Design an enzyme around this catalytic site. Structure first.
Site, PDB file in Angstrom:
ATOM      1  CD  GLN A 143      -0.648  -0.306   3.605  1.00  0.00           C
ATOM      2  OE1 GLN A 143      -1.805  -0.021   3.846  1.00  0.00           O
ATOM      3  NE2 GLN A 143      -0.257  -0.977   4.792  1.00  0.00           N
TER       4      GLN A 143
ATOM      5  CD  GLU B 296      -5.545   1.915   8.114  1.00  0.00           C
ATOM      6  OE1 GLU B 296      -5.354   1.939   7.118  1.00  0.00           O
ATOM      7  OE2 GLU B 296      -5.092   1.609   9.218  1.00  0.00           O
TER       8      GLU B 296
END
Lengths: 171, 32
Positions: free
Chosen positions: A22, A108
């Protein structure tokens, strides 16, 4: 008190537990000031910052992760507004193998300290040109599983997807 | 939708994903 949130694209981590490739950007707020940074991570290894790229409010960012094998690939962050582009290549020597079963566009509330960092009100984040490549073919988020954050009996986000975009709004 | 404590967004579940990309504008942040 400091509040933060992150936005990133990645491979694996939901139904595949051994790794996550990521890359993204963190946005933090604290007493009238803001802090932004770009980073990459091949979980379970630590996240590392891209120190040679400046991120500012309003800039257009393009993020991309690519896997050349289950244990190699790259993470790229391009600031379209300034013309800066940085790439970290993972030639191997990683700490986890990808399953290549999940492709995601995520905002997130990351872990920091004893729990998750206080979650910032980011207004809304929209990922455009949201595309994943599987077997040589490109697919959008149309059939994706939609996820939202819920903590302490409070829904904190509302997510909507289209054929080529994902929008996450703070609630 | 599916709720979680830490992720909000869209997740494709399938096989063979080798590239994922997206473009976004850096948001204005304030206290939650």
């Amino acid at each position: 008190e400091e509040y933060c949130a992150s936005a990133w694209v990645g491979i694996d981590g939901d139904t595949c537990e051994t790794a996550i490739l990521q890359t993204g950007v963190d946005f933090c707020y604290e007493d009238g000031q803001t802090s932004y940074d770009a980073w990459y991570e091949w979980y379970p290894d630590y996240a590392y910052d891209f120190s040679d790229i400046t991120i500012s409010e309003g800039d257009s960012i393009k993020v991309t992760v690519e896997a050349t094998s289950k244990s190699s690939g790259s993470a790229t962050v391009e600031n379209l507004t300034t013309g800066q582009s940085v790439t970290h290549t993972f030639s191997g020597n990683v700490e986890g193998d990808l399953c290549e079963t999940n492709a995601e566009w995520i905002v997130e509330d990351f872990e920091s300290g004893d729990s998750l960092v206080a979650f910032a009100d980011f207004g809304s984040v929209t990922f455009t040109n949201a595309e994943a490549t599987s077997g040589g073919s490109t697919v959008g988020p149309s059939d994706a599983t939609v996820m939202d954050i819920e903590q302490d009996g409070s829904v904190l986000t509302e997510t909507s997807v289209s054929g080529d975009s994902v929008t996450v709004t703070y609630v | 939708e599916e709720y979680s404590s830490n992720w909000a967004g869209a997740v494709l579940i399938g096989d063979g994903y080798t590239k994922v990309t997206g473009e976004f504008t850096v948001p204005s942040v304030s206290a939650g």
